[PDB]
Ligand binder design. Structure first.
Ligand SMILES: [Co+2]
Ligand SMILES: [Co+2]
Lengths: 246, 246
């Protein structure tokens, strides 16, 4: 359990929410400590979102994983802030590593680990003041949030995260437009090579971007057309594809 | 059955190969016409690779699909050269649209449809002189090519295609390096904004690139953790993700 890449200037703060159907209840006691979660937090009759807001303490989380049944191999990845975006079947929990794009003057990239077990969602954040603000607010209102399992919650987070990527992409395009300009507008209009290249990159994107998605079908879909022997081979092209854009 | 985007300067030429285990046989009669395939080509005891090398004729292929049991919806996509890279379960055949990157002076993008049914591989190419050259050569040699089903063949093609993407990516990087230079070396070294941006784009790539892959797990993997009711929601983030880079 080793941690690299300091990014908080604060100490860890666990916080958990409990919701029981459309019923107006949303009990969210911040009093999780480590012992204040393994025992007192059980009650296998309620919906729980454990929310960890500090990942510097390699001791705390290593045990927090133990106390939630989060496989070791995931736990070290939760600590490696520079992990690739992935998903893993564990198989009593789904573990995924995401990335958050923070335009704090310079673009900053934070990590957001997410864990889903049977009626249990464990998120792991670098900082706070996130986009999870409304995920609290949606748990505040008597909606489809409370009525539905952890699976729906995990979804809502992914939906919030993915929304913010349209923000970044928008800002990034302005930047290109602004740089492309002062290059071209920079009297050196003898450069229509920018757009020859621009089309080469986007042609590559369209070619290779959906590709990892295509190859992973053979890798994790039961089908009478791919024999359980040729799976080896498919996983390998998939690997080659993964590395293309790494 | 409508076709757009002319790119051949030649007429359609069907060609089929037949291989029966490690046995030194590799019967590949070009005499497929349309009637010379529906009937004579049956023999449900052999391994068949139908190889179509022209996609301009919306009449020919529409019936070629019929004669291979290739769903209509796929067949129109086989004709739409400007389709996105995709895969579909049909479910007696897998249908995928790929893209081939051809550095013929200017980068050129061709389409390569692929269809896999039970012991049957149907490819659909824009031009010839492809990378399929060795796929013939591998069928020529008494290897694991012949011994194994269509699933393995479909794989070998994907492996050849994916290999060629490392070629493009290599050439594209030179182009960037060369343009980045004559921009910077273009006396306007007052531009370290290139690398501020370069890191913003690559940070986006690392964030969003593996993402479509991550979201598609929930979409097409049977799992006791995602209920068969919340699938709707997941498919939707997936859709949002698909559009990000489209
Ligand atoms: Co390999
Ligand atoms: Co939507």
């Amino acid at each position: 359990p080793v941690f690299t890449g300091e990014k908080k200037v604060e100490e860890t703060k666990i916080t958990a929410a409990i919701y029981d159907e459309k019923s107006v209840e949303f009990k969210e006691l911040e009093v999780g400590e480590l012992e204040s979660v393994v025992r007192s937090a059980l009650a296998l009759n309620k919906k729980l979102w454990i929310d960890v807001v500090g990942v510097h303490d390699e001791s705390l989380i290593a045990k927090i994983c133990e106390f939630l049944g989060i496989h070791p191999l995931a736990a070290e990845d939760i600590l490696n802030t520079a992990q690739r975006v992935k998903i893993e079947d564990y198989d009593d929990h789904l573990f995924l590593v995401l990335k958050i794009l923070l335009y704090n003057e310079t673009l900053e990239i934070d990590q957001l680990s997410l864990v889903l077990k049977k009626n249990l969602v464990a998120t792991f954040e670098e900082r706070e003041y996130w986009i999870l603000d409304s995920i609290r607010s949606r748990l505040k209102s008597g909606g489809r949030m409370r009525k539905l399992a952890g699976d729906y919650l995990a979804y809502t987070i992914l939906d919030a995260v993915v929304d913010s990527y349209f923000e970044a992409l928008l800002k990034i395009s302005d930047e290109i437009e602004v740089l492309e300009d002062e290059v071209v507008s920079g009297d050196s209009t003898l450069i229509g090579k920018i757009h020859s290249l621009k089309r080469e990159i986007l042609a590559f994107r369209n070619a290779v971007w959906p590709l990892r998605d295509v190859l992973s079908f053979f890798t994790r879909v039961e089908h009478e057309l791919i024999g359980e022997e040729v799976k080896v081979y498919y996983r390998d092209v998939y690997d080659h594809a993964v590395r293309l854009m790494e």
